[PDB]
XYZ file of C-alpha atoms in Angstrom:
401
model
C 98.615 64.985 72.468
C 98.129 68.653 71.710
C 99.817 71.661 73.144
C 98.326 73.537 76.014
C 98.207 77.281 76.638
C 101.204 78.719 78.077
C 102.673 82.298 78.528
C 103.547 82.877 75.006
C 103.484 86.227 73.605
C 102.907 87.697 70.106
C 106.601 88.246 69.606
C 107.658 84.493 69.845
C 104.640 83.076 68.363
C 104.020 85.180 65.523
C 106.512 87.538 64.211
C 104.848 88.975 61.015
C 102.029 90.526 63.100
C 104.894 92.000 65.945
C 106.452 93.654 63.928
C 103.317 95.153 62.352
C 101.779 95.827 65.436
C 105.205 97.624 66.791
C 105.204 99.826 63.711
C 101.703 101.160 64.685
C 102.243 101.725 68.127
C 105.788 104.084 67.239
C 103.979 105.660 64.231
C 100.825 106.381 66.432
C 103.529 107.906 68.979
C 105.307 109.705 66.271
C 102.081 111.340 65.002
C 100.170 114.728 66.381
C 96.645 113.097 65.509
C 93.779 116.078 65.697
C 90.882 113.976 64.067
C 88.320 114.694 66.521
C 86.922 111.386 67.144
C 90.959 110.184 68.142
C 91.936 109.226 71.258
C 94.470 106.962 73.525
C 92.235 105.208 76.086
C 94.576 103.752 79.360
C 96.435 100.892 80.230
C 93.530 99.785 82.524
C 90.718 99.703 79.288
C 92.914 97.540 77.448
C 93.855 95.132 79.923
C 90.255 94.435 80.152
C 89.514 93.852 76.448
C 92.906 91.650 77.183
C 90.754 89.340 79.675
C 89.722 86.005 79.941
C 86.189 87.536 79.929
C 86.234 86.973 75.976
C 86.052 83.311 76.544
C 82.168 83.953 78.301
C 79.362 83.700 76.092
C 76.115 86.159 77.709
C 72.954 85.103 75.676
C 70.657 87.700 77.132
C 70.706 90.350 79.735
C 71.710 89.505 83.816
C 69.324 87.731 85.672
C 67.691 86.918 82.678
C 70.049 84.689 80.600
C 69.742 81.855 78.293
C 72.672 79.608 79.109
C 73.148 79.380 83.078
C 76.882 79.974 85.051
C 77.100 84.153 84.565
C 77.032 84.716 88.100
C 80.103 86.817 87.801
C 79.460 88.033 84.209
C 76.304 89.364 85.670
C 78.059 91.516 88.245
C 80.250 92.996 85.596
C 77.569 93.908 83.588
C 75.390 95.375 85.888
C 78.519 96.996 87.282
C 78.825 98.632 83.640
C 75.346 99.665 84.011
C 75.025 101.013 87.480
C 78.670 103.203 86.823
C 76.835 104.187 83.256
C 74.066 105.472 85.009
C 75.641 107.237 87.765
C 77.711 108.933 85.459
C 75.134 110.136 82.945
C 72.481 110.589 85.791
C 70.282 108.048 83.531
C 67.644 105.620 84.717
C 68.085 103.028 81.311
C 71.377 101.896 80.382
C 72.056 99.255 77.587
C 76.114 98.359 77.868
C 75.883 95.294 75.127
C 76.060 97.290 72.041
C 79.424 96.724 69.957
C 79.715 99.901 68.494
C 78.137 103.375 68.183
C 76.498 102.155 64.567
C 75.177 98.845 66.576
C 73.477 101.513 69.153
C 71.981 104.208 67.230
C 70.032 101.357 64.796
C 68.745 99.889 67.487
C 67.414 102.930 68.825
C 65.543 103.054 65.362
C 64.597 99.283 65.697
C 62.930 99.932 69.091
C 61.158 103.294 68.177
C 60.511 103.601 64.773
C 58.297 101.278 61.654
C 58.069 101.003 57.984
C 58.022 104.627 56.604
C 57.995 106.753 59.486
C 59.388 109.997 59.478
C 62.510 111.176 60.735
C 64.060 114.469 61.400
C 67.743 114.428 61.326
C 70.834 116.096 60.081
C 72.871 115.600 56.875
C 62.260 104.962 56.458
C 61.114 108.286 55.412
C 63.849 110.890 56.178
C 63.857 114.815 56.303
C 66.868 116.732 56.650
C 67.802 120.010 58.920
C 70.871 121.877 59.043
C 73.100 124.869 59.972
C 72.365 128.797 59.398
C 75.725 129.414 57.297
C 74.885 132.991 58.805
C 75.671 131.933 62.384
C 77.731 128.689 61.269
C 75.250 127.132 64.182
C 71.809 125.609 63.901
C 68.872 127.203 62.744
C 66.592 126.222 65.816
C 63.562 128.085 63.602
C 64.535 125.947 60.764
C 64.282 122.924 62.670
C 60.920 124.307 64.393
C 58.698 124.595 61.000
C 60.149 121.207 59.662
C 58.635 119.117 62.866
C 55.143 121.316 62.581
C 55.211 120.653 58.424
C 56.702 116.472 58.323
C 55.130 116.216 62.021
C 57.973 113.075 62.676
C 57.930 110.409 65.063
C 61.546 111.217 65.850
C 63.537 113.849 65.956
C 67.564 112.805 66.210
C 70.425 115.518 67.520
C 73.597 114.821 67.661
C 76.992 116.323 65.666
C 80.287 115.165 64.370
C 81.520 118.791 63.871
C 79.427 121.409 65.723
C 81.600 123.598 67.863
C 78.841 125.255 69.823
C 76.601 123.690 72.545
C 73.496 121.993 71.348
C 70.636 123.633 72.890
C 69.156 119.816 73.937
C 66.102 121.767 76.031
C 65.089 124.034 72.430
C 65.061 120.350 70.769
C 62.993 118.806 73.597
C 60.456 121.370 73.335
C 59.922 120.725 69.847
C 59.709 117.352 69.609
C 56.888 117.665 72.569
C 54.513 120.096 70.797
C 54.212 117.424 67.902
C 54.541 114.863 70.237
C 58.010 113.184 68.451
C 60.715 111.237 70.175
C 63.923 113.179 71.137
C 66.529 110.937 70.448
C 69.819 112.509 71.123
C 73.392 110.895 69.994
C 76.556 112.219 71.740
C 79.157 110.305 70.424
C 80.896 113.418 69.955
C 81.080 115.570 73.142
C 80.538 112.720 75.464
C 83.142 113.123 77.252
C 82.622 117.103 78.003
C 79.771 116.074 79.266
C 80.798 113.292 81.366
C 83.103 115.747 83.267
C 80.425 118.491 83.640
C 82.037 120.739 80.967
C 79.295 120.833 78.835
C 75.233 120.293 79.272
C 73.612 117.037 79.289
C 70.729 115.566 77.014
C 70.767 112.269 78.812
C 67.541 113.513 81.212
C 65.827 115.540 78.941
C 65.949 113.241 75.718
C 63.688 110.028 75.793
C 66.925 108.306 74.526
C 70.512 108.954 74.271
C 73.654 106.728 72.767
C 77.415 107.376 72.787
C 79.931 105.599 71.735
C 82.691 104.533 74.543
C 85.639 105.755 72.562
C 87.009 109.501 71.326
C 86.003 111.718 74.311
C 84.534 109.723 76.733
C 88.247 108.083 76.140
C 87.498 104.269 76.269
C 87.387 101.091 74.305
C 85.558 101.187 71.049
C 82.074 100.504 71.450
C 78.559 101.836 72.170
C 75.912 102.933 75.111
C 72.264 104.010 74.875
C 71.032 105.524 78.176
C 67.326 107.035 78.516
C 65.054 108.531 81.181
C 62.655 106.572 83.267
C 60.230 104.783 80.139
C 58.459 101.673 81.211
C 57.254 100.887 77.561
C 60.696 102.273 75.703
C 63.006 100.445 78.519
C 61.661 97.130 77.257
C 61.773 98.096 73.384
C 65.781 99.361 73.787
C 66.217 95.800 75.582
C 64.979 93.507 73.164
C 66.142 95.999 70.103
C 69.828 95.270 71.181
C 69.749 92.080 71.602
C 68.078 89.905 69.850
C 66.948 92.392 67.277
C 70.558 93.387 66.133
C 72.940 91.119 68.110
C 74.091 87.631 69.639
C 75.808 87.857 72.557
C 77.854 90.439 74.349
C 81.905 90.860 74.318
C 82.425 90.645 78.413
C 85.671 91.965 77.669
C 84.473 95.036 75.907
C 81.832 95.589 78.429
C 84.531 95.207 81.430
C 86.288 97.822 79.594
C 83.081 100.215 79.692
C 83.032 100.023 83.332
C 87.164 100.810 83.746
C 86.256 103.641 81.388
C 83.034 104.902 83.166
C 84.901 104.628 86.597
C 87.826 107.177 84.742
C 85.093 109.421 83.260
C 84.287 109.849 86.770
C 87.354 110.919 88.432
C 88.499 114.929 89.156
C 91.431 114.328 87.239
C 89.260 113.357 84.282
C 86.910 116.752 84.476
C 90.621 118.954 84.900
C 91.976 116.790 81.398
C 88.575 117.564 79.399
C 88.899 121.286 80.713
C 92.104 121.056 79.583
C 90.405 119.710 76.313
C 88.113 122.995 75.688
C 90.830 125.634 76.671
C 93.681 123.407 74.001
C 90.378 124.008 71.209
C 90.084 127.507 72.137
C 93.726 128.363 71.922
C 93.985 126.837 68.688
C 90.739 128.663 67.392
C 92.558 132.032 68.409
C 95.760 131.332 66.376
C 94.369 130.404 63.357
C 91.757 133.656 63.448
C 94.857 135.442 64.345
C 96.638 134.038 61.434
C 93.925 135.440 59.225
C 92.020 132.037 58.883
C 88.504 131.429 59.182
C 86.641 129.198 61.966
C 83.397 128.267 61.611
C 80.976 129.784 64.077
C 83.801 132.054 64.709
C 85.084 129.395 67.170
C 84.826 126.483 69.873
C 83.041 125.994 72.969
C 84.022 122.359 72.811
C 86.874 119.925 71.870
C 86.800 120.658 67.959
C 86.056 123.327 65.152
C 86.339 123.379 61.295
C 89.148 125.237 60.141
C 87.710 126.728 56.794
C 89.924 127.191 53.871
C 88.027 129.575 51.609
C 90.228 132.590 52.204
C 93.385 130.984 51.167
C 92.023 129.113 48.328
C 93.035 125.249 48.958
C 91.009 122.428 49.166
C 90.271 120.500 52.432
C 91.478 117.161 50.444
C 94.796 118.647 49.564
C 95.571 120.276 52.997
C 94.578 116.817 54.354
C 97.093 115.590 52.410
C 99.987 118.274 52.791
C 99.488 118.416 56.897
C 99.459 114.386 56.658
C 102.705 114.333 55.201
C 104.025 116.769 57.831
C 103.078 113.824 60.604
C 99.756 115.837 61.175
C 96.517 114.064 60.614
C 93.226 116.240 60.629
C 90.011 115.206 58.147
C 89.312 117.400 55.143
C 85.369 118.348 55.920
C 82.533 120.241 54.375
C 81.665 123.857 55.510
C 78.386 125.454 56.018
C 77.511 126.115 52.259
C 80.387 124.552 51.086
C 81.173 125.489 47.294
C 83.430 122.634 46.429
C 81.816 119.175 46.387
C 81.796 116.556 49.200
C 84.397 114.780 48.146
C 86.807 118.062 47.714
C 85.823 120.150 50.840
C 86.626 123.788 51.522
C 87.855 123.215 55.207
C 89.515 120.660 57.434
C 87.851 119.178 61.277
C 90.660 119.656 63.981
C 89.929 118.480 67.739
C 92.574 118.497 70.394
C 91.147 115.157 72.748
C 94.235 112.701 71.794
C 97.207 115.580 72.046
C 95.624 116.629 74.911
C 95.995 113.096 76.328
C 99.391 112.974 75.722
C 99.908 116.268 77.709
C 100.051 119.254 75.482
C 98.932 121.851 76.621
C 98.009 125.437 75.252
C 101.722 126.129 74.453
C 102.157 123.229 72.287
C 99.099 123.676 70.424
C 99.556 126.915 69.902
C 102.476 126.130 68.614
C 101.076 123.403 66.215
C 98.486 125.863 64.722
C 101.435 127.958 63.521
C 102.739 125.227 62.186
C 100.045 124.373 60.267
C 99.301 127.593 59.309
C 102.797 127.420 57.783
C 102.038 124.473 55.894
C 98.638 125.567 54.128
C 99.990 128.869 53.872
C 103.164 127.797 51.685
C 100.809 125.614 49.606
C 102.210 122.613 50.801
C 105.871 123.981 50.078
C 108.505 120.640 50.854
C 110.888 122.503 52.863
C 107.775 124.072 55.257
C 106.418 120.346 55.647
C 109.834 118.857 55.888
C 110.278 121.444 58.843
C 106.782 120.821 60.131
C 107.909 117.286 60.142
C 110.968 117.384 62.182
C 109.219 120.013 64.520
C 105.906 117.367 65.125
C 108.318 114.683 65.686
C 110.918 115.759 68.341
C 107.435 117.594 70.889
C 105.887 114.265 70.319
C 109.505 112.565 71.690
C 109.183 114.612 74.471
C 105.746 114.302 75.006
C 104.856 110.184 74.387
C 100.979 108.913 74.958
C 102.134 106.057 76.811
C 105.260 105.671 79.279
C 107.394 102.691 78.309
């Protein structure tokens, strides 16, 4: 005899991990967390990674599996698929990637070969980049590079751009030298999900997100395209079996809850509410005699810079981390301290958003953090930062008990 499975919890199987995994959860709700790609995804999204759909191994793609008995695994999936396309407006989806890396290489699996050339942002690979003078991109920049390298792809798609990616200038230019657009909104997907910000999903020939940050679901990744007889089949067999096994079920039953939210009127009001929590804090800190990059947001993040006051983005990482908030030292345009130093810190408002701040609040965080780099890190401002940060994240918790 062995045992069999019963209802029998973390807690009075295993202790050790409880305890760890309680710590986490009190210290995530004890925490203002402004790293842009954070966020809380619902109750719903995790009861599905929770499900017995782990236990079903997918070989393949519905319809067309290896191993027979998915009739039910197949509705889920396609499920995924059909509420991924309705909510992009795309004719291709691909639901089985794990994760946004697992997504984006297999867009390069399916499109590119040995040596081709690439035109990207910081195989043969050229670079393009931001006008420091606008703190946005240099679309002429970007123009000459494709005419000059003449790539088979050019790739858009930004981890701290705080102004709306012309997708149609990009389109354009990867049609005169006859390039694929390949467009990765990981970032803003979730402005664009609720219609708060324009989409690239019809105009480039393919487009990946990850599920997470502000689409607001379970960690993983998406590729959508237009209608592409020829690129359809390359993204299919790219995914799987070029770069994976099977699926997770779970994870892709989780994509659907999460596609289904993304959908919803109360999701477009809590991403508007997104944009306008960015925007207030982008007013305080200019206010407060700081600079922003671009001179501010039209989306969910910006780049505080910290030139003026003369601190590094690693230390006021540090100092604002020890006051309970958690931002991400990053480079500026032209930055003159090294990568590793930074002149500037990311902030993005998605996760204290979730948890119901609202321009108030983060208005009032700004200030505080303003205090914080100000002082130079000073121990009584932080210790008062601290106490401040924890008691408005008591009243406001990201999930109700």
């Amino acid at each position: 005899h062995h045992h069999m499975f019963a209802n029998i919890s973390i807690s009075e199987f295993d202790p050790e991990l409880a305890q760890a995994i309680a710590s986490e959860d009190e210290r995530q709700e004890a925490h203002i967390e402004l790293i842009a790609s954070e966020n809380y995804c619902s109750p719903a999204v995790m009861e599905a990674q929770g499900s017995k759909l782990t236990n079903k191994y997918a070989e393949g793609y519905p319809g067309k599996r290896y191993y027979g008995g998915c009739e039910f695994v197949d509705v889920i999936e396609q499920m995924a698929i059909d509420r991924a396309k309705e909510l992009f407006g795309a004719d291709y989806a691909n639901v089985q990637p794990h994760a946004g890396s697992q997504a984006n290489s297999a867009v390069y699996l399916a499109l590119l070969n040995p040596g081709d050339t690439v035109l990207g942002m910081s195989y043969n690979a050229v670079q393009y980049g931001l006008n420091a003078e606008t703190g946005e991109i240099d679309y002429e920049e970007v123009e000459r590079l494709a005419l000059e390298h003449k790539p088979r792809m050019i790739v858009a798609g930004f981890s701290a751009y705080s102004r709306v990616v012309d997708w149609q200038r990009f389109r354009d230019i990867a049609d005169k030298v006859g390039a694929y657009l390949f467009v990765d909104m990981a970032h803003v997907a979730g402005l664009v999900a609720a219609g708060v910000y324009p989409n690239p999903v019809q105009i480039a020939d393919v487009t990946t997100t990850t599920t997470h940050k502000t689409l607001r679901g379970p960690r993983s990744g998406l590729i959508l395209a237009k209608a592409n007889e020829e690129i359809e089949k390359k993204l299919q067999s790219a995914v799987f079996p070029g770069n994976q096994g099977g699926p997770l079920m779970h994870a892709i039953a989780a994509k659907a809850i999460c596609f289904k939210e993304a959908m919803s009127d109360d999701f477009k009001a809590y991403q508007q509410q997104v944009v306008k929590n960015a925007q207030a804090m982008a007013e305080v800190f200019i206010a407060r005699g700081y600079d922003v990059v671009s001179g501010g947001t039209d989306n969910h993040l910006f780049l505080l810079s910290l030139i003026k006051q003369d601190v590094t983005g690693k230390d006021a990482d540090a100092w604002l981390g020890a006051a309970h908030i958690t931002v991400n030292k990053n480079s500026v345009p032209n930055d003159p301290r090294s990568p590793f130093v930074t002149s500037g810190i990311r902030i993005g408002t998605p996760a204290v958003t979730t948890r119901g701040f609202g321009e108030a609040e983060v208005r009032e965080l700004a200030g505080w953090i303003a205090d914080v780099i100000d002082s130079k890190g000073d121990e009584k401002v932080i210790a008062d930062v601290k106490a401040k940060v924890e008691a408005v994240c008591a009243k406001f918790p990201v999930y109700a008990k």
